[PDB]
């Protein structure tokens, strides 16, 4: 396909060195993040089109939902630290936005317990230095790209995906176009 | 614990004859989506209001451009027909979740799917009552010098300050907010 700067993507005026190859930002509070993940499966469809040598990274943001948003960012750090993102993503989105059973950090904890992560194992991770580092890493990455909203995706610290410049009439087509754009920017 | 500057602020220029409880929002605002779809602020405020106190909710158009203008007019229609409870969710989801709402025609579809007759909507849309209601919403925003949403005003005198409330627990937040409105109203 024809790829144009300003159309399917934009080019950062202030590129970032040492950024993840493919960096996605989300919030468990965000309805369009919910749409991206639970409905369109944007991440999975992007992964399919990348060589497996190109790693995908996903960070939570805290600028949504106040202190609970910060707790969710810490919980996402636990998920990353323990490698259980694929177990907790769906019940966290459902819990925050659909069933509205996630109202505080203790409810987040129960989701991890039900996903197979024992209470003592969750608490250990929650209070670990590795998780404190991952929280700071997520915050720093957002600040380094001057992030103001979600969902957002950056490639090689150089480009930002521009879904608004893509064909949004057909959702199957949108997803293919989105994923193909990430591929093109990465194959650089 | 109820301190000016904490849970609320006082308007330098109070508004005479303003609605008792006045909320402003935009269907384009992610923070308004949070307030309405996740926190259900309006509902919980209503539950704590004294029986003789009514809630007023207006749409603002400083975001979203021409469609923002159309959404303010659609909200007028919603108010004129009394169908706010039928269209709020699909309008919020259509603009922000699915992003299916991009024109006036898309807005109209939501009303139809919500069980509101097609001749009803078009008569309302083009009515003087709706023209008046659009101007009413615009006047109210100007009267309180509105610079952001979501926002809530009590008696044209006090503005809610959610920044001064506890956000660790969403139920605790919602109830501190609802209680503040009640304290200011009483």
């Amino acid at each position: 396909a024809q790829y144009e700067d300003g159309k399917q993507y934009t080019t950062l005026e202030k590129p970032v060195a040492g950024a993840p190859q493919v960096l996605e930002f989300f919030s468990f509070f965000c309805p369009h993040c919910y749409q991206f993940e639970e409905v369109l499966h944007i991440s999975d469809n992007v992964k399919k089109k990348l060589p497996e040598g190109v790693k995908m990274t996903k960070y939570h943001v805290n600028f949504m939902g106040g202190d609970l948003g910060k707790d969710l960012t810490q919980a996402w750090a636990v998920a990353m630290a323990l490698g259980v993102e694929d177990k907790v993503t769906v019940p966290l989105f459902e819990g925050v936005q659909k069933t509205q059973t996630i109202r505080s950090a203790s409810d987040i904890r129960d989701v991890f317990i039900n996903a197979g992560i024992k209470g003592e194992e969750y608490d250990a991770a929650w209070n670990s230095f590795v998780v404190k580092s991952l929280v700071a890493q997520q915050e720093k990455a957002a600040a380094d790209v001057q992030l103001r909203g979600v969902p957002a995706m950056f490639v090689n610290g150089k480009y930002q995906l521009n879904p608004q410049g893509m064909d949004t009439s057909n959702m199957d087509v949108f997803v293919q176009q989105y994923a193909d754009t990430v591929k093109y920017l990465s194959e650089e | 614990q109820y301190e000016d500057g904490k849970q609320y602020t006082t308007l330098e220029k109070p508004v005479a004859g303003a609605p008792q409880v006045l909320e402003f929002f935009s269907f384009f605002c992610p923070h308004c989506y949070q307030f309405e779809e996740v926190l259900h602020i309006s509902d919980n405020v209503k539950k704590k209001l004294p029986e003789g106190v009514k809630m007023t909710k207006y749409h603002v158009n400083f975001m979203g451009g021409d469609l923002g203008k159309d959404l303010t007019q659609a909200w007028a229609v919603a108010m004129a027909l009394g169908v706010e409870d039928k269209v709020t969710v699909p309008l919020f989801e259509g603009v922000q979740k699915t992003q299916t709402i991009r024109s006036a025609s898309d807005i109209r579809d939501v009303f139809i799917n919500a069980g509101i007759k097609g001749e009803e909507y078009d008569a309302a849309w083009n009515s003087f009552v709706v023209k008046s209601l659009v101007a009413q919403q615009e006047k109210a925003a100007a009267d309180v010098q509105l610079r952001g949403v979501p926002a809530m005003f009590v008696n044209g005198k006090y503005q809610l300050n959610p920044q001064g409330m506890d956000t660790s627990n969403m139920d605790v937040f919602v109830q501190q907010y609802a209680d503040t409105v009640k304290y200011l109203s009483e």
């Binding site: 949504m64 909203g149 979600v150 969902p151 957002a152 | 384009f28 400083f62 975001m63 952001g148």
Partner: peptide, 8 residues
């Protein structure tokens, strides 16, 4: 995307 906070 659009910023979260709704000002101006």
């Amino acid at each position: 995307p659009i910023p979260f906070l709704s000002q101006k």
